[PDB]
Amino acid sequence: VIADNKGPQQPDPELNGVQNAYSNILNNYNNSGLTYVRGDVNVFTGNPSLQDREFGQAPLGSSFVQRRPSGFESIRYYLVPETAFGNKALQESDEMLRAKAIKSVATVVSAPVLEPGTVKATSFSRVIGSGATSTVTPKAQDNVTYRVYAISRDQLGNETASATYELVRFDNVGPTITGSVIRDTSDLPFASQEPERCLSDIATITLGGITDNAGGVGLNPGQGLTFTLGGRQIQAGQFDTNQLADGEYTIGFNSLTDALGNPVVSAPTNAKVYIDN
Amino acid sequence: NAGWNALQLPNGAGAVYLRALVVDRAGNATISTTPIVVNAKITNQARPLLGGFDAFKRNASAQFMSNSNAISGVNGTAVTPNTTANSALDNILSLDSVGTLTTNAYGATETAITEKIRNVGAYGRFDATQWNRIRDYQLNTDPTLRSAYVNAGNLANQRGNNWRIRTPWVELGSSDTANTQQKFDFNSDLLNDFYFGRTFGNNDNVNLFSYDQFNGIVSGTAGAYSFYGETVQK
Amino acid sequence: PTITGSVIRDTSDLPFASQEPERCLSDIATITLGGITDNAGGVGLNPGQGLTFTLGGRQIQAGQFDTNQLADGEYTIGFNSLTDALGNPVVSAPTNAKVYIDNTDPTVNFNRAVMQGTFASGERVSVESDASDGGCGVYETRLFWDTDNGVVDDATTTPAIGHPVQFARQRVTDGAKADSLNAGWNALQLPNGAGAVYLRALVVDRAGNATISTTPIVVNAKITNQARPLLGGFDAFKRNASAQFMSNSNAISGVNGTAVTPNTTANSALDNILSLDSVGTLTTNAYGATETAITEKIRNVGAYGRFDATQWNRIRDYQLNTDPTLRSAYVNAGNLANQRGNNWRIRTPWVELGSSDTANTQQKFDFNSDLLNDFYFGRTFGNNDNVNLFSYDQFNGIVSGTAGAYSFYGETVQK
Amino acid sequence: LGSSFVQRRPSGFESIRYYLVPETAFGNKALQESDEMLRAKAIKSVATVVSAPVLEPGT
Amino acid sequence: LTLTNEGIVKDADNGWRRLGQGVSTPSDPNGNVDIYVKGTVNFSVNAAAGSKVEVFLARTTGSDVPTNDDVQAGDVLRSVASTSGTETFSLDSRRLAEFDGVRKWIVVRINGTQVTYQP
Amino acid sequence: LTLTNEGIVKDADNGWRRLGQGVSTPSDPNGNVDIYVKGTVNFSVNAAAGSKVEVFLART
C-alpha cells in the first residue's frame, strides 16, 4: 500500500473584474481592505504552481526513486459571510481543520475546478454573479460582506485551505431622488387663490435630494444634483418668477449614478405650475 | 503517528528531542520525551536566504525589514489579537519571495543537481506568561505533588525531566507558493488555538490566551532552515 | 434648441500609451464639452444659462479629468435637458460615445522557476508566466533576465551587464482577459562564479497599464566554464561608411570616428551596422583527452538595442512616484507602492534585435538596424515625435558559448 | 541528463529564399525589425520580387 | 504541416509533422521518427462513454527535486468527469522549454487507473 | 473513496482508492498502479478454518 495523509499546497484566491455593460469594480473602499463589485466578479487561483504533498526524494532502497503522492485533484471556492466569524470557536490552525471550518459555515459555494482552463482564461477561473441583470450562477447577495476562501484537494480527498482570503461586497441598486416643490409666497397686492398652481412674483422653492440605498457603497463624495425650471437653473429658496416667461413649467433634475455606476432606481414627478404676471 | 522532516544547522551534528504533550478531560497534562541525533546532510551547507518580512494589520500596508534568523520587536505596523469578526483587524505575516532562496545543491553533467525549498510555515508562539503559569503549576504548585496518596518523588522526577522547557510554537499553517504579489503570506487573528473554545474554553483576559509572537520557518529539501517573525503588540 | 455631443479622450501616455485613446481610458483624460444653442431667428434662450454634464456619478467640467475618481467600467457623458425662453423642449440629442475606465495593472506571476535552488550555466531553463487583466485586457508581454536588483543608476554597466536583457516577447491581438508566456533561456554566468539571476516579466494592458513580476534563481558556472569568450575588434558605423574597429571587450565604448544615429527615413544609406571581427572571436572553454578534445563551441552572437535612459527614467518615475493611482482614494496605496518598489527599481532594459550568427564572407558578425525602439513608432505603441526619446541610446552585442560563458560589446548611439 | 537522445535534435534546416523589396516600402516605420521571425513576416508582407526557395547548396 | 507542390511546408504559426531523422559519423547510425510540434497544437483522446479523462504534461505525480523537475496543478491540460466518447485538448509547445529537441510525453489517465503516454 | 457524479472523490476522513500513475520527461515513462490509503483503513484476510493467522506491518 501507499500512504497519503497530506493535502496539496495552499491555493491563493484572487479577484478580477469582468468587462461588460453591467459590471463595475472598486478595489479598496475607505481603507477597509474591501472590494466592491456590481454585476460579476472573477475568482481565480494566483499560484497554479502548487503541487500535492508530501513530495521529495524517497528513502534509500525504495520502490521508487521519488515520493509519489496521490497527486493534485481539484480547487473549490467558498464565500462565507463575515458575521459567521463572530464565533471564535471556529478553527484557524491545522489547514485541514481550517478547511472543515470553512465548509461548516459556507453559504455560497462554487463548483470544483478540475482544470486550470484555456490560455485565454485565468487559472481555475470561476465567475460570481450578482444583481438582476447577471445570469451567472451561483449568485451572491447584496449588502453582505463575504470572505472568499479557496480549498485545494488531492486525489484521495485530503484538503487544505488558503492562508489568506479576499473581502468582497456587492451592490446592484441605484440611488433615489425625492420630490421638489415651488409655492407662491408673495401676497402683495392680493394673494393667489392656490399657491400650488397660480404663481406670481417671488416664490419659494424647496428642492429634494439624491441618496444611495442604506448599507450600499454610497454616492461619490461632494456630488449633488442640479435643478431647472423652464429654461433656467434654480436654487432652493427665494426666486423671482419674473425672470422667465409665462406659461406652464415643471421642475426638472439631472440623473446621477452611485459610486459603482448604478442607474437611478426611482425618480419623482414634480407638480406643474402656471406663471402669470 | 506522524512524520517529521528532520532539520539541522548547516554542517552540524546535534541532539533533537521529540516531545508528546497529552491532556485528559480534567485538565491532567503529561509530557514524554525521546532523544534522537540529527546530522546535517552533505548538501546541507548554508541556511536558506530570507527576503524582507513584516507582520501588519490586514487593512494596513507592510514595512519590510531584514532580520533573518531572529525575531523583531514591534515595528511601525503593530499586530494585535482580534476578538471580533471584523476582517479589517486580522493580522498578516508576509515574506518577500524575491530574496528567498536556497543555495544548497548536490556544474555537474550539463544539469545541476540541486535542493529546492520544501515548506514555508507560519507559527504562533504560546504566550510566555500563561506558559510560565502552567509550568510553575506542573513543577511546584500542583496539589497532587503534596498529595498523601502519591509517590511525590517519582512524580517530581518525571516532571522535572519533561516540563523544564521554553514556551512552544503552535503550527498555524503554511504560506507555501508565492502569490501574484511575490509574497508568502499568512492570515490569523492571533488567538491561541489551545483556548477560546478551539481546544479548551477560555475567553477572558485576551492577553494571556493569545500568541505573543507571529513567526515563520523556511525549510528546504536538504533539511536547512531559517526563521523570522515579529512580537505581538497585544 | 440643439445640443452638441462631447468627447473624452485618453491623453496620459506614461507609462505606455493606450491602444485606443477614446475607448480604453487610464489616469488623466481630456474632456471637450458641447453646448446648447437656440434655433436661428428664435428668441435666443434664457441668459447666463448653460448645460451641466456628468460622467457616471460625477459632475464633469471641460479640461483635464482624473479617471481615478471613478470605478473601472463602462460610462457615457450625460447632460441635462434645458428648454428655450418660450418653453419649447430640446429638439435633438446626440448619443455620446461609450468609454471604459481601467486604472488597474495586470496581475502577473511565474509558475515555473519558483521556490528555487540552482541551475548550471549552459542548460536551458523553462520560464513560464501568466498574466490577466479584468479591464481592457492584456496586450504586450516581455521577458528579461537581470543580474542586479534594486538599482536605478543608469549609464553604468557591470561585468555581468546588470541591466534586464530581453529573451522572449509576445503580443495578444484581441486583448484577451488572460495570456501565458512560455519560453526557454540558456543560462549564462561569469566564469567559476555562483550568483542570483532575476527573471522579470513586463506586461502592459490596452490603456497603458504596466506591471512587472520577478522570480529569483541561482546560476552556477559549469566545470567547463572557466574563461570569458575572446572578442575581436568591433565597431558601429553607418552603412555607407567604413568600420574603425576597437578592442573594448566587456565594456561599452563612446562615440568613435564613425557615429551611429537613428534613421527615420527609408534611405538605406543611413542605416547602422554593428560589426564584430570573427578572427579574434574564440572560446577557450573545453571538457588532450583520448585523441579527440572535448570542447565547447560558440552558441550565439546576439545584437541588442538599449532602451533610452531618459524615457526609461520617466516611465520608472511615473510608476514609482507620479502615477495618480498611487494617490487614488479607491486603492491600497501601500500594497501598490510595495509591489512596485520591489519590481520597478531596475536599470534601462536591453531589447533583443536579433542574432549575427555565423560569420560572413568578410569574416564579420554584422547586424543592421535603424536604431528605432520597437516599443514605439507603431511597432508596439504609436509614438513618433521626439526621436531622441524613442530611439536606442546604445547598440550592443552578446557572444555566448555552449558552456554558458559570455562577453558583451557595443557603442553609444550619437542620436 | 537522462534525455531520450544525448544531443538536441531540432527539426533541421530546410530551405533558403531570396526577397527583393523596394526601398520606398521601408518609409513605413511601423514595419518590424527586431525578433527575426517578425522581421521575416514583415519582409514577406512588402515583397515584390520573390525567388523560388533553394533546397540544395548546389553543385 | 502538409507539403506543398513547391517542396516546402505550408506557412502556419502552429502545426505538427511526423519526421524521420538519422545521426552517424563517427558513431554507428541511429535514427528516430517522431511528431515534431510548433506553436499551440490541438489533440484528441478517445475513451469509453462516461469515463473520467485526465490529461497531463510530463508527470501525473512525483516531482524530481534533484533535477529541478516538478509537477504542478497547472500541468493538467484537460480533465472531464464524464466523456461522450472523445475529448479534445490543447498543448503549447513552448511549455517545458528545457526539452527542446528531445522527447517529452503527454500522459492520459482513464478512470484513475489506465495510463497511456504519447511523446 | 468512490467517485461522485461531480468528478471528485467523496468526503471522508479515512479511505482507500486504487490509482494509476506515470512519470516521464526527461526519463522514459514508468508507471505504477497501487492502492493509496489515508486515515485508518480496515482490511480482511481469508484463511482455512482453524488456522492460526498473524498480520504484521513491514517485517515479521
Numbering used by the authors:
A (entry chain A): 357 to 633
B (entry chain B): 712 to 817, 821 to 948
C (entry chain B): 531 to 817, 821 to 948
D (entry chain A): 416 to 474
E (entry chain A): 238 to 356
F (entry chain A): 238 to 297
Question: What text appears in the publication on this structure?
Answer:
In addition, the OM of D. radiodurans is covered by a carbohydrate-coated hexagonal surface layer (S-layer), a proteinaceous, paracrystalline layer commonly found on the surface of archaea and bacteria. The S-layer in D. radiodurans is thought to be composed entirely of the Hexagonally Packed Intermediate-layer (HPI) surface protein and exhibits impressive hyperstability at high temperatures (>80 °C) even in the presence of strong detergents such as sodium dodecyl sulfate (SDS) and denaturing agents such as urea. In general, S-layers are involved in critical cellular functions such as maintenance of cell shape, protection from phages, biomineralization, cell adhesion, molecular recognition, and induction of virulence.
Images of the isolated S-layer revealed top and side views of S-layer-like two-dimensional sheets displaying a characteristic planar hexagonal symmetry. We used a previously described single-particle cryo-EM data analysis workflow to resolve a global 2.5 Å-resolution structure of the S-layer within the planar two-dimensional lattice. At the sequence level, the HPI protein consists of seven β-strand-rich immunoglobulin (Ig)-like domains (HPI1 to HPI7 from hereon), six of which (HPI2–HPI7) were resolved in our cryo-EM map and revealed an extended arrangement of the HPI protein. The segment comprising the HPI1 domain (residues 19 to 131) was not resolved in our structure, suggesting flexibility in its position with respect to the S-layer lattice. The domains of HPI exhibit a bipartite arrangement, with a long linker (residues 220 to 229) separating HPI1-HPI2 from HPI3-HPI7, suggesting that while the latter domains form the canopy of the S-layer, the former ones form the OM-anchoring stalk of the S-layer. Each monomer spans two hexamers of the S-layer lattice via HPI5, which is arranged as a twofold symmetric bridge linking adjoining hexamers. This extended arrangement partly explains the exceptional stability of the D. radiodurans S-layer, since there are large protein:protein interfaces making up the lattice. There are additional gaps between the D. radiodurans S-layer hexamers that are even larger (~76 Å), resulting in a relatively holey structure, suggesting that this S-layer is not acting to occlude small molecules from the cell surface. Additionally, the S-layer is stabilized by many salt bridges that form an extensive network through the HPI lattice. Finally, there are two cysteine residues in close proximity (C554 and C666) between HPI5 and HPI6 of each monomer. Although densities connecting these residues were not observed in the map, they could form a putative disulfide bridge connecting HPI5 to HPI6, further interconnecting the lattice.
